[PDB]
Every structure is written in C-alpha cells, then in structure tokens.
Amino acid sequence: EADCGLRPLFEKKSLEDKTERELLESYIDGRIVEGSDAEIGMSPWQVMLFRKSPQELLCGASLISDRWVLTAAHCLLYPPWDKNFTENDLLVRIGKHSRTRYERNIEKISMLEKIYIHPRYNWRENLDRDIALMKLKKPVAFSDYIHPVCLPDRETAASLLQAGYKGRVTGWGNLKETWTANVGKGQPSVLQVVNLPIVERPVCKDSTRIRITDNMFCAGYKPDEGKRGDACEGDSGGPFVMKSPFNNRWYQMGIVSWGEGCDRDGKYGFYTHVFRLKKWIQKVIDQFGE
C-alpha cells in the first residue's frame, strides 16, 4: 500500500500528535500517567470487530488496505470458549472515535467476504501464531478518519522492534473489559492511547509461566517505577504501532494477543510479532485478494 502510515490529519497536514516525539526520541519521562484520550484521526487504521447479533464490541483490528483487516486468531477461533465465527456472524466499524455513539458521515460499517487464520495458530498450550485476516465484502473508501497502517519490511522490523524503543497501543479498553476481575471504572467513551517501552526478551520470559514464542514480544513499564500507562487500555487483536524516523510512516509491529497477564499490574502486555508471520500475511493478500 503506497500511502500507508501517513495520517490525513497529521503527516499530510504537517501536524504532529501530542506524544509522537517522545516515541521517536524513545524518551521515558519521570511522569506517572500515560493512558489518555486520543486526538481525532490519531489512529485512522483503528477497526472495531462487532458481533452482528446482538451488537457488541468483540475485538480490535487494524486496516492494512482497502480490502484487508488484521486481527488476532483468538478473536475469531477459540474452541475452549466455544468461539467459532463465520464471515456472516461479524461486521467491522472503521473511522470511529466515540466508543458508543454512531458517528454518521465519519465511521463506515463493512461486511466480511472471508476469514483466514494462520494454519499453525495454536490455542492449546499458548496462543502461538495468533494472527488472522478478514477480507471486506467491498473496498472501504479512505477519508480523513479512515487510512491504512504500513506493515513492516525486514529492515523496518530489525530497526524498530528493539528493547527500550517506544510503541503505541490504541483502543477502547476491550482487553480490560474482557479480563478485569471487577469492572471498577467503566469502559472509556473515546479512543484511548498509551505509549509503552518494548521489554527485553529474557525479562518477558521470567515475567510469566506461559511459554513465550519468538512469534511474540512484550511491552510495558516495570511495576518498580509505577506507571498509569495500561496495555489493557488496548483492544484484543488491536494494533501496536511505531513511527519510522526514516520515512515518517506508522508501522504495525504487533497485535494485542492473549490478555491473561492483564489482571495483576506486575506483568507486561504480550503482542504477536507481525513481521515474523509476514510470509503468511503477504501470501493471503497476494493470492486471495484482487
């Protein structure tokens, strides 16, 4: 996709969002608070996966072209929970800011032609190769509020996905809503944003009893320096993104995966490693698109 990762309301208008410079500088401030309301059009690739009947937010997702949405396999297929969705059970909403309000003349509703799950998706032991693509029935029309994110190439993945560099989780707290012991505060009313440092692989592994695959990375602050930035502000199967200092473009480096780690805030967020699985993604796009 030629235009990917340049937002109409930012890169295309020479405007910057409130925290992108802190990402590009990999700066971690002394401040405690991180997880705030997003600016309109800050995340124009942001997608909601909704159940047809009754209407409910199942998951997050991301727009990668006019016909292609990316999410987590577990959003579509989780036999232990009796979760098994067809194209027909689902729609997506693209361009949203408000969690609850129907945003007439801004948001678009699409149906799915087809669902594709990584043939080596494993829900049994750990959530390995937790990735899926959804083909829209009809191409969606890009707008100020609807624009695709880039997927990384080999050099962008090596360059951006490194311990101590800073990436971005956007969503409507659907991960929190799914996994929260108690619903204390309610779900956010507007799109949330949080910037999270990528964690050393060995620190990730020691943090959990889940067998951490190389198909996964993790991000978040040490409990030691207590921060209010919460991954659970993210949506299950939603985007983890980074800005390239080389071409000024937003790349999706991760998918919000399994969110059992969410419950006690001494753990980190676990993300599917997009570039690791790009051969499958590109094969599906090349062979089952146009």
Author numbering: 1C, 1B, 1A, 1 to 14, 14A, 14B, 14C, 14D, ...
Please share text taken word for word from the publication where this structure appeared.
The structures show all Trp residues correctly labeled without significant perturbation of the overall architecture. Extra density detected at the 5 position of the indole ring in all cases supports uniform labeling of the reagents used for NMR studies. The 19F-labeled prethrombin-2 structure features a conformation of the active site similar to that of WT (RMSD = 0.33 Å). The presence of well-defined and separable peaks in thrombin as opposed to prethrombin-2 suggests that most of the Trp residues in the zymogen experience a similar chemical environment. However, this conclusion is not supported by the crystal structure where some Trp residues are exposed to solvent (Trp60d, Trp148, and Trp215) and others are more buried (Trp51). An alternative explanation is that Trp residues in prethrombin-2 exchange among multiple conformations leading to broad, overlapping linewidths. In the case of prethrombin-2, the W215F substitution affects both the large peak around −47.9 ppm and the peak at −49.8 ppm, almost 2 ppm apart. This suggests that Trp215 exists in alternative conformations that exchange very slowly. The presence of two peaks separated by a large chemical shift indicates that Trp215 features two distinct conformations that exchange very slowly or not at all in prethrombin-2. We conclude that prethrombin-2 is more dynamic than thrombin, with most of its Trp residues in slow exchange between alternative conformations and experiencing an environment that changes significantly during the conversion to thrombin.
In this study, we investigate for the first time the conformation of the protease thrombin and its zymogen precursor prethrombin-2 in the free form using 19F NMR. We labeled all nine Trp residues in thrombin and prethrombin-2 to interrogate the conformational properties of the protein in the absence of any added ligand and Na+. We labeled all Trp residues of thrombin and prethrombin-2 at the 5 position of the indole ring with 19F and solved the X-ray structures at 2.3 and 2.1 Å resolution, respectively. The nine Trp residues are distributed over the entire surface and function as effective reporters of the conformational state of the protein.
